[PDB]
């Protein structure tokens, strides 16, 4: 027939980690490797929903460069540690977490004041280091639900953070040559995916394909 | 936030018989180019269409020949028949017949009329007869397919025998010749982040622009099932 297309027969998932996988689909029609790979890549990168830190207000800091005593990082690095804070919120679109910690040593994410609906995916995520044994850091962290990546340069004494809403942190793919019964023009799509922990990789691939296939539902022939 | 606006096939503008502009609207920010390039690749590579795959001229034994009274070689007649833009309803194969005599051009309007076979460009010159006693008579087997299948690969179908005199034509089945697209900012009742995709198709006339978008989106949405389940 002229409407029957090769559909992926071999789907090999290799979980290199809890948050990193390689999904090999084979075989695709010639040139479908790049179609599916690039559509999924674009959706995983810039259109996938999720929730991440957008703003933070530290008690004694007025702008991104004013340093704070007792902490071994400049504020430019506390914000860089907060940007990578993988967080889930179930029932809201905006939460204001609070991190109060004084004394000596690392301030991990486990020291954030608990709210029942906000999970922290990696409670061993270090945010700053207190050094003086009377150093106290008290900050308010605005977790906000969105989609994609929204740099702080666009959203312009609160401090802005680039809001990496998307759970995906690296999506790559390459299309190598598969073969079926002496046809070598077929394709084989190797997707290499790493999420931040809020979503296992194959679940992110599934949610991206669901997003695309739900966009297309106004044209499909059932 | 988790909700996405879904594009509808808002407008189709048939600029010409072979050229059209289909508008998908509204699209969320970012899905403009995603759908644009996905549909562009799917259309431009996997559309089904009819093409001439076999010619049988009565006095001719091979392509590297001439018919007395026909201005073209048989090879140029075959290269002209390769571009016959035809659409067939309800068949995957049909054997058209051409009979013409007398001085003048032999065009696709001179093909014997079948009801379920629509020749979309009757002015397509197939050959020229330059003698009042010359006459050409051929059988033209058009076939439905997908993509480009050259004749040197279709010699693989070694059924009982192919006669001597059955000239094989390379088959380029896809009807789409050009696909452009543009993502322009068009708005809804009250929103500014919505985009509008305008897919600008140029076909040989043997496919309907809406049907091509529906077929492309169906190919895509049935190829995404292996990703939606991911077993």
């Amino acid at each position: 027939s002229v409407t029957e297309f090769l559909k992926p027969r071999l789907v090999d998932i290799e979980q290199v980690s809890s948050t990193h996988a390689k999904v090999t689909l084979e075989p695709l029609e010639r040139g479908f490797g790049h179609t599916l790979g690039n559509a999924l890549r674009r959706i995983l990168l810039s259109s996938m929903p999720g929730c991440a830190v957008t703003e933070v207000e530290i008690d004694g800091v007025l702008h991104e460069y004013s340093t704070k005593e007792g902490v071994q990082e400049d504020i430019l690095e506390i914000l860089l540690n907060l940007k990578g804070l993988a967080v889930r919120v179930q029932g809201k679109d905006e939460v204001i977490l609070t991190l109060n910690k004084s004394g000596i040593g690392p301030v991990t994410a486990a020291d954030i004041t608990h709210d029942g609906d906000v999970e922290i995916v990696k409670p061993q995520h270090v945010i700053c280091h207190l050094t003086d044994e009377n150093a106290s850091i008290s900050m308010r962290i605005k977790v906000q639900r969105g989609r994609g990546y929204v740099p702080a340069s666009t959203r312009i004494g609160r401090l802005l953070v680039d809001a990496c809403y998307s759970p995906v942190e690296r999506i790559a793919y390459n299309v190598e040559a598969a073969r079926v019964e002496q046809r070598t023009d077929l394709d084989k799509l190797v997707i290499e995916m790493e999420t931040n922990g809020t979503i296992d990789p194959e679940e992110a691939i599934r949610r991206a394909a669901t997003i695309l296939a739900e966009q297309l539902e106004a044209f499909v022939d059932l | 936030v988790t909700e996405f606006l879904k594009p509808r096939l808002v407008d189709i503008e048939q600029v010409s018989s072979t050229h059209a502009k289909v508008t998908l609207e509204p699209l969320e920010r970012g899905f403009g180019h995603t759908l644009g390039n996905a549909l562009r690749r799917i259309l431009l590579s996997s559309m089904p269409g009819c093409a001439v795959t076999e010619v049988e001229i009565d006095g001719v034994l091979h392509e590297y020949s001439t018919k007395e009274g026909v201005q073209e070689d048989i090879l140029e007649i075959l290269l002209n028949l390769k571009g016959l833009a035809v659409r067939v309803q309800g068949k995957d194969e049909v054997i058209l017949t051409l009979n013409k005599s007398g001085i003048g051009p032999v065009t696709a309007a001179d093909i014997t009329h079948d009801g379920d076979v629509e020749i979309v460009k009757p002015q397509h010159v197939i050959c020229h007869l330059t003698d009042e006693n010359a006459s050409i008579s051929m059988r033209i087997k058009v076939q439905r397919g997908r993509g480009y299948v050259p004749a040197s690969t279709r010699i693989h179908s070694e059924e009982d025998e192919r006669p001597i005199g059955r000239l094989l034509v390379d088959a380029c089945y896809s009807p789409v010749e050009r696909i452009a697209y543009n993502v322009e900012a068009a708005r809804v009742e009250q929103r500014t982040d919505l985009d509008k995709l305008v897919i600008e198709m140029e076909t040989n006339g043997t496919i309907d622009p809406e049907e091509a978008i529906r077929r492309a989106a169906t190919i895509l949405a049935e190829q995404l099932e292996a990703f939606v389940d991911l077993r």
Binding site: - | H62, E63, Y64, S65, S152, I155
Partner: protein, 50 residues
Amino acid sequence: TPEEKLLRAIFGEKASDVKDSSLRVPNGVSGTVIDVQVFTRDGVEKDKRA
């Protein structure tokens, strides 16, 4: 040879007197025969196609 002497006596036919020296298309080339020119020596019987 002896083993082949037993073989063609088993399946019941020995080889003919003539050898296959026919013209064949070279490997890889595949075309259409567009012309055949037959030249026979003067005094040789012309076959039917000549």
